[PDB]
Amino acid sequence: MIQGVIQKIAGPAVIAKGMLGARMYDICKVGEEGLVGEIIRLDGDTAFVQVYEDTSGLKVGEPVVSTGLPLAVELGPGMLNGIYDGIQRPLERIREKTGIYITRGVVVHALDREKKWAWTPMVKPGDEVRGGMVLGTVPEFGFTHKILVPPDVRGRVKEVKPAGEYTVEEPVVVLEDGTELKMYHTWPVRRARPVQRKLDPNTPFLTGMRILDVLFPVAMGGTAAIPGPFGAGKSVTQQSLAKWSNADVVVYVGCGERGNEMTDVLVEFPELTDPKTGGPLMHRTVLIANTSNMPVAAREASIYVGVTIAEYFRDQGFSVALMADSTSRWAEALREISSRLEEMPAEEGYPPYLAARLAAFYERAGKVITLGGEEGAVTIVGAVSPPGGDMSEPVTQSTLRIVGAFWRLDASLAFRRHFPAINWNGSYSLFTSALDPWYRENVAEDYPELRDAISELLQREAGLQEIVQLVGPDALQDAERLVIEVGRIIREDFLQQNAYHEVDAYCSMKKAYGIMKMILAFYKEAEAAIKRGVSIDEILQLPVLERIGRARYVSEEEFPAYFEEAMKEIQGAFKALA
Amino acid sequence: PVQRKLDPNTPFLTGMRILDVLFPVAMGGTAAIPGPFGAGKSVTQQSLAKWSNADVVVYVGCGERGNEMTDVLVEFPELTDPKTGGPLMHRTVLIANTSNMPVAAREASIYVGVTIAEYFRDQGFSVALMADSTSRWAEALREISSRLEEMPAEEGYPPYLAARLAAFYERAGKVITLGGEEGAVTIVGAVSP
Amino acid sequence: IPGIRAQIRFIQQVLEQREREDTFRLKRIKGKIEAREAEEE
Amino acid sequence: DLLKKEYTGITYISGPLLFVENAKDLAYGAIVDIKDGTGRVRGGQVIEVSEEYAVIQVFEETTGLDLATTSVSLVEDVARLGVSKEMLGRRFNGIGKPIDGLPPITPEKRLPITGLPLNPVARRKPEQFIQTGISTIDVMNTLVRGQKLPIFSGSGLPANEIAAQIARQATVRPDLSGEGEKEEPFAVVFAAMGITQRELSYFIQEFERTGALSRSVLFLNKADDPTIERILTPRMALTVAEYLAFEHDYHVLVILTDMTNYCEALREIGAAREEIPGRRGYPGYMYTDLATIYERAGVVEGKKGSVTQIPILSMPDDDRTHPIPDLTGYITEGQIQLSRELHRKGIYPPIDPLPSLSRLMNNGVGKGKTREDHKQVSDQLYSAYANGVDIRKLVAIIGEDALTENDRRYLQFADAFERFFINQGQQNRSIEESLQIAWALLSMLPQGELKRISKDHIGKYYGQKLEEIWG
Amino acid sequence: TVAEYLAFEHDYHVLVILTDMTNYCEALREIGAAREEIPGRRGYPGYMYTDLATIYERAGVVEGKKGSVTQIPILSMPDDDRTHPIPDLTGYITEGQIQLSRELHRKGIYPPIDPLPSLS
Amino acid sequence: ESAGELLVATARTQARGEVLEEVRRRVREALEALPQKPEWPEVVRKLALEALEALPGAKALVANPEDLPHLEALARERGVELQAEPALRLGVRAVGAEGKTQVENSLLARLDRAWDALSSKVAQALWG
Amino acid sequence: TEALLARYRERAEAEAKAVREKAMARLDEAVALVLKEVLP
């Protein structure tokens, strides 16, 4: 056990002395109070520690002890329905222990060592176990939590517990080599967990929003970014994705953000209902909250903890969705530490390894074949907060060159109170062509063509806007005023979505199909009618536009009849006038 | 020090219609007149020095042309004070630190001027202080901070320039002096962006 | 067109000035790390 | 304990810093007393300590110190403040000492002025709606009790009058939520940082008119006080506020009168130390630093008090992308942004509703609260006003005669909106008056164009005329 | 120095013509950047105003003497930009300006002095 | 309106201030006469002892000549030199090894360090 | 109009005397306690 003493203190940094033999990125206990830190630089006889807690009141000369092991999490039953801080400590226990504020130095366990779980074995003596295989299961909130062998364990089974209630400390299986396999294990948060093979992304990740699910979709293992200035409503979109997506498990990482958002999740998710299993919504969610006024050095800790928990649940054969609340805050934590490491920085003060860290983090996502020969996925959706709304700063650019889809929020739409406020001209997605067979087989045989026609119409209206700007919209010919008007309709009747409405919040995909289909039918008929001398003004007064603009408020079970009525009403809106 | 700061209730008349009507300044108030070159800032400052209704005028020429100081010195003995019968120069104090005199003395001149104005206020008069340019004082600050190897703020200026400016402008105002009488000081600072 | 060209050249001036300031700062801190690593040698 | 230790051996004084050697017995963050050859004692705080020497940031100015005679002695290991209920009629300077001539207070507790973060589990959702009597805030950017809501002002715009009007008129409306009937007034904690004499006299005369001084605590750091003291003013004010709220169940309202001066002090003390800068020289940790102040607000589960913040800050060149407003917007919940163009038209209060925002607005409006049509009226107003502004932009190119009829109706709506709904000028409007005016203004548009409001709310509110509300 | 000697020792009336201060300012910038000083608006040293002042302020007339020193600086505004640091700083020091116009040059006029933006 | 309330509250506050000030003056005068009491030598010895225990490695001791003889019998045990001085009263002040560190243990010093901590006790015990 | 000021002046002086006397009651114990505590 290497130990030394404090030599210098400044900010969240501590320089220890006499630490010869300590290893890079080991966890230490700083001071007599025992704060947690991590070695980030060795220099002769000294070590440079970044402390994960407040350092005010420390004194020169206190002990510093290295534990010899890098940061790690405890992976086992008992993580769902919970809330943790940046280094995996249960906040409910900290609350029932320290009151309404968070004091430093609390030591608590990640998993509760007293609750008893219903073990149910699935291996027999003499069997061969191999890293990643499943030993048994326990029930957890309507899931089936599989107990896995750690990735670095292999051997033969000597004894396996019969059944019944046990706590997570119980050696449910002991190998012929004498190792005891409890219900949980630890894993270093900086090492990606291994898999057998990576697969191709060919199933959509259904978010519930029309514009994202239709125009800019994401595959079940892809990555996405959503950067926007303050006031554009990033938190609303993130919480909507956490509410309505079709993931089995949601892991929500609030890195460096407002605390009221975490409280909103905590207070509201127990009252909502899980779309798939029908249970409460908090039973499929894991929060990792490290708010703005918490220690700075714990932000990257929270990011890594979140992604490791997501990879664990993926290893059990689930589809996980990871929501990183901001990576700009992580980058700023890095810059703050580098300020007193006295490094020579890159553009705008960020340390030079930042793009490498970002790539390493976004590359853990994907759809895999697990070590136990099963299928699971992790889908990352990270938010960016560019300083000054400037989309050219280093974090945003470093993110563009990695992600698969890119959802750009703009301020002009947010001022208009028109939400989701996704900039159509600046967003893209690289997953459409690979997802088209799924759409043809599961939505409708011509879904790709309707999507393409809507994209072409939006592009053509964008092209006309340039002339509309210099001559005014009344100077166009009727054939182009029609495109302007149908663009307005597409915008405010299909793209727009009400997050607080009881029925417009979640929108199935066949509903989006129907709406697109009837908008296109109307537009085609109106172009035909213009080819016959009908003026553009009475076309705008046709009262079937009310049906079209109201369609999105119809329930998912009431919709097919509505759409079948509306199609023939559209047809009659023009064939009957003759 | 003073006994009590009061609120200004009486206009400081400059003699120019646009300033006295549209954008008045009160007796103990503070004004700023920033103007690019060729906009006649010098004539306006001289007019403010020539026709104001203050009892005493303190003119601080912090890093500006010398012909302006000469204009004052030559013309003012001829002009008559409106309030009393005396010459205009009899109510004026000049501090002259022109553009080719030592740089580090511009700040000293600013502080000297405002201290003399505070003294005459303490005597019960109502003083007007015209700081002929504060960008020159800012440049002196920047030069000295450059000799000190300090890290600068946005445009090479030291990071404490706003504090010095605020502490200088905060010496103005209507007061009840320590002797019990009432005086005031009005500051009109020029800038040169 | 003249007004837009004016705005553009103004923005370009500001950006170049900021870049010059920060490279000055970088040079200073590099000189500093070298000095204070050599003095401890 | 009680014995005193003095450190001689000062080795360096420049600007706001002071290095002292052989001082390993000082804790990181301690408070010290610097005494010179005259006997005058001034304060400081240790910001870096090592086995060789410790670095001190002096609060006062460093005139008169010398390397031979000054001494440094410890005061306490953590910077604390003595709080009490009996400070509800007092004035202190920027570091907590009385300046009204009365004796100091007798502290019930001594609390660390840095505070501790609230537990996200211990928090509560803010829901109580506050009626400020201002329509552009009440109807379009509702303020709830326990919220962070800054005011993005300019140089010559009247943000102080808006803050004082809010303090004078703010009240909860318990008859609309049906819960409670105490309506106990707000206690006001007012922290001024680098304030001038004109604005200080304004605020004092205002509170003296309203009689709100007997329940207000005042922390004044004027513009001729030292600069580095501004580091302590907001922390002291919020320490007192959190004490009052979460011990004696007050409902506190905190007003922080200029965060720009706070950031100036921060940048100064951060450049003296050569931190890696942010965008315009502001230190790289300014985000965390401001977050430790703004996040000391909200409501706690299982307690009756609350804390509400109204920071005021002046965007330097009316620039929304400057670092200070940018970060503050990234922290707080929405903002109230003032407009210079509206101010030039004589409109008071010059709040333009498009770049404003209140994130917690949906927690405290609707049925069981103000009225069931509040939300839809609000966003319908937003849509119509945006349309009016775009049509102005078009008129600027193709002339007013070339317009259609509905375009002229939107132009007229924008104009009447600005001149009747925004411009109220010191009168106190209940929420019902505000919604009544909003509907009278909406009735100018054809009933078929209010596409964000339901059919029944239209049926039972449409059709009022503006001449009826007033002539 | 020659002009001052002549004027205030032999009662001469001297007219000094400095033909291009735009080159003077580039030389000054190049020399200053070799001493590692803090830059200015476009790379020009932070003290260009004081340096130009020590040159321009050497003209004038003295009391009790008959000589005089009149200066006519000449400089080319880069890109015809009036806000460039060179002409701008020269504007704050001198007592007016004479401006040459391009349209009068195109018309074939000579000398193409524009009388509307000029002043003494 | 509330102006009268402010008046009565100001009166109360300043009255409490007067009485607390009086108590403090009372103890300030009770202290400044102790070097005539028979417990003087032993309290001075323990004061110097805790002072020396606060500077590991002092080089001297400054005190008052009038109570200098009270202080010889306990410094020889550890070798810390002596020195007398008229200005230091009601206590003793050490000196650190470099000359750049001191520790004073005067009476009035401890009083000014503890009075703020004990003000709450005096209030709660002198009113309720 | 002024009867309020008169009533309040009376209340202020009354409470001032009340506090002073309630203090002079046990001041003799307060001072002894402080001297006990300040001493080593």
PDB file of C-alpha atoms in Angstrom, chain C residues 5-36:
ATOM      1  CA  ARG C   5     -19.020  43.936 -47.355  1.00  0.00           C
ATOM      2  CA  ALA C   6     -18.474  46.391 -44.508  1.00  0.00           C
ATOM      3  CA  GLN C   7     -19.994  44.021 -41.955  1.00  0.00           C
ATOM      4  CA  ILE C   8     -17.893  41.153 -43.283  1.00  0.00           C
ATOM      5  CA  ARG C   9     -14.579  42.974 -43.122  1.00  0.00           C
ATOM      6  CA  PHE C  10     -15.450  44.162 -39.616  1.00  0.00           C
ATOM      7  CA  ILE C  11     -16.170  40.650 -38.358  1.00  0.00           C
ATOM      8  CA  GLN C  12     -12.988  39.411 -39.990  1.00  0.00           C
ATOM      9  CA  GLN C  13     -10.946  42.059 -38.203  1.00  0.00           C
ATOM     10  CA  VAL C  14     -12.350  41.093 -34.823  1.00  0.00           C
ATOM     11  CA  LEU C  15     -11.684  37.402 -35.356  1.00  0.00           C
ATOM     12  CA  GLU C  16      -8.094  37.965 -36.443  1.00  0.00           C
ATOM     13  CA  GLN C  17      -7.463  40.200 -33.436  1.00  0.00           C
ATOM     14  CA  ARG C  18      -8.686  37.563 -31.000  1.00  0.00           C
ATOM     15  CA  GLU C  19      -6.492  34.966 -32.668  1.00  0.00           C
ATOM     16  CA  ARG C  20      -3.448  37.202 -32.298  1.00  0.00           C
ATOM     17  CA  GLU C  21      -4.123  37.758 -28.598  1.00  0.00           C
ATOM     18  CA  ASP C  22      -4.422  34.081 -27.818  1.00  0.00           C
ATOM     19  CA  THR C  23      -1.257  33.145 -29.682  1.00  0.00           C
ATOM     20  CA  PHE C  24       0.580  35.776 -27.657  1.00  0.00           C
ATOM     21  CA  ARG C  25      -0.722  34.104 -24.513  1.00  0.00           C
ATOM     22  CA  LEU C  26       0.321  30.652 -25.727  1.00  0.00           C
ATOM     23  CA  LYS C  27       3.858  31.809 -26.388  1.00  0.00           C
ATOM     24  CA  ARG C  28       4.022  33.243 -22.893  1.00  0.00           C
ATOM     25  CA  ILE C  29       2.896  30.066 -21.166  1.00  0.00           C
ATOM     26  CA  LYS C  30       5.312  27.926 -23.150  1.00  0.00           C
ATOM     27  CA  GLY C  31       8.183  30.178 -22.159  1.00  0.00           C
ATOM     28  CA  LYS C  32       6.946  29.846 -18.590  1.00  0.00           C
ATOM     29  CA  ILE C  33       6.809  26.057 -18.478  1.00  0.00           C
ATOM     30  CA  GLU C  34      10.303  25.896 -19.920  1.00  0.00           C
ATOM     31  CA  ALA C  35      11.691  28.439 -17.462  1.00  0.00           C
ATOM     32  CA  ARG C  36      10.171  26.795 -14.404  1.00  0.00           C
TER      33      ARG C  36
END
